[PDB]
Design a protein around this nucleic acid. Sequence first.
DNA 1: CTTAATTC
DNA 2: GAATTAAG
DNA 3: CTTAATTC
DNA 4: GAATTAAG
Lengths: 255, 255
Amino acid sequence: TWLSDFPQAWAETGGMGLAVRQAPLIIPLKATSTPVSIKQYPMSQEARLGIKPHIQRLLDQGILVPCQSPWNTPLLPVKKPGTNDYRPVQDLREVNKRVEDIHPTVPNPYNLLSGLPPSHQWYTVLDLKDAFFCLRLHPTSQPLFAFEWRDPEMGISGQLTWTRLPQGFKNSPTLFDEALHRDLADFRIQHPDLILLQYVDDLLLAATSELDCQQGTRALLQTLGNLGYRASAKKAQICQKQVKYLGYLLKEGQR
Amino acid sequence: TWLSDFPQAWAETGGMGLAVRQAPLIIPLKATSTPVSIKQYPMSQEARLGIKPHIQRLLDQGILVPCQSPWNTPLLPVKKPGTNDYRPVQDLREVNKRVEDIHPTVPNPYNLLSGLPPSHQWYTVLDLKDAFFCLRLHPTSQPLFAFEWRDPEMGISGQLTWTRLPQGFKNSPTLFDEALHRDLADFRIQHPDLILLQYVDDLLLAATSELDCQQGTRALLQTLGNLGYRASAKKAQICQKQVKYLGYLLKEGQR
DNA sequence: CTTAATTC
DNA sequence: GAATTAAG
DNA sequence: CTTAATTC
DNA sequence: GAATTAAG
Ligand SMILES: N=C(N)c1ccc(Oc2ccc(-c3nc4cc(C(=N)N)ccc4[nH]3)cc2)cc1
Ligand SMILES: N=C(N)c1ccc(Oc2ccc(-c3nc4cc(C(=N)N)ccc4[nH]3)cc2)cc1
């Protein structure tokens, strides 16, 4: 009943996340950067109809808000199979080129796993849902990610932008990893005998016994829920001696 | 009257050369080499008519002789401007690949000229005509360079081959340089105060005074003539303080 | 005429 | 990978 | 739809 | 240099 014991921690039962302890992020631009406004390539009705539901959902969630900005980047008619799942994909390359670089602090999977001791063979893997959207963007940095949205049948005035850390932004993974690391520092301190590996939104908790893993997982879920993050209950691998993490299969202390 | 004083040394007055002091060359094959017989691509009448005179001249000079050989390489319809000067060009690449490698002892022009002292500013440049043809090929190595020659109007049976070091053979330049160096060793010994640079068939004699250059050039021409080599009287640059050698212009001690 | 390398 | 060179 | 890289 | 990839 992991699902029922922690209603707030699961994305399926706790509503959209919001890292309440994290201050809205301010995105520094390179010293010579000036806003760039790239025109939106005309989108076909089919692509527009596919994307529409997502845009409305995000507007309802307050993740997207109307705005007028000197910045503008293109939205793409992206999918995968044939012409389904039209999730909106923003081409933020011209924005990324004007944003100041930050040190890449997210360790590569290989080195991250090196920190997994043979002594801890009871694992719990969790992946946070819509992780980036949990981090607020400071109002001053919001205009930077604006894009155009039109509804030929009288819909929206013009531009919309993100109030949360967006997908496609070059520093989103790193900024999210650093945050969360900050939010989970106390948990690590409260559970010295537990191993916690973090790779952006993918978490691995390792314990020496099934009990400790159970007690540790309870604590982690409780903490994540309270902080405003949400884990996928569907994909959760709880207290297993064999789990799939970052492309590896952890078994018998191997990999 | 350099031309009249040394009839035997100039190609224009001494007949074809023949290095009488040099033993016929034997060309060692790689340890696993076996003869290769490449078919002659059909040659058009125009190409055949252009090449014909050269082949006959060489046969008359004994430089080319009939033969039957398990080796055979192609003759090419080579020219330059449009369809003139049809000098025979043999593709000896499959023969070169089967001949044992030798150390490249011919110095590059740059290093060779480094041996030209500022003290010697009176130059004489000579280039030997048909240098390679002056070196005899041992009968045992002759079959290696065979090619096909036909005269639709009943001319030659089949193959012809060289009795002299041929053009297109990978070791001809080096073998010629080494020979000649051997033939001119005494001259260097008899003229210690003279500088003699050799680059295959291109010679540069350098002296400190116009007189020494005159006396030295006389001696060199006499020696070359007696040994069986022939210098181009037309291109000869005699006792000049400015001469063109190996692409460089030697002047005021420069280059 | 082939063939090995260099460009685009 | 189809032109373009360079060279025997 | 772009755009930067990789192949052939 | 024209395809083919990969990715925002
Ligand atoms: N596809 C196209 N339109 C074009 C393709 C190629 C182009 O240029 C060039 C093609 C070939 C060379 C070039 N080729 C060689 C071959 C050499 C050898 N191995 N003998 C030795 C040196 C050398 N230089 C130099 C430049 C220009 C245009
Ligand atoms: N001319 C032709 N018929 C062909 C041309 C190209 C062919 O293959 C390939 C083409 C392109 C790739 C390839 N392209 C990329 C682009 C990358 C990027 N910068 N996002 C990152 C990694 C990557 N791999 C790999 C193989 C096959 C056939």
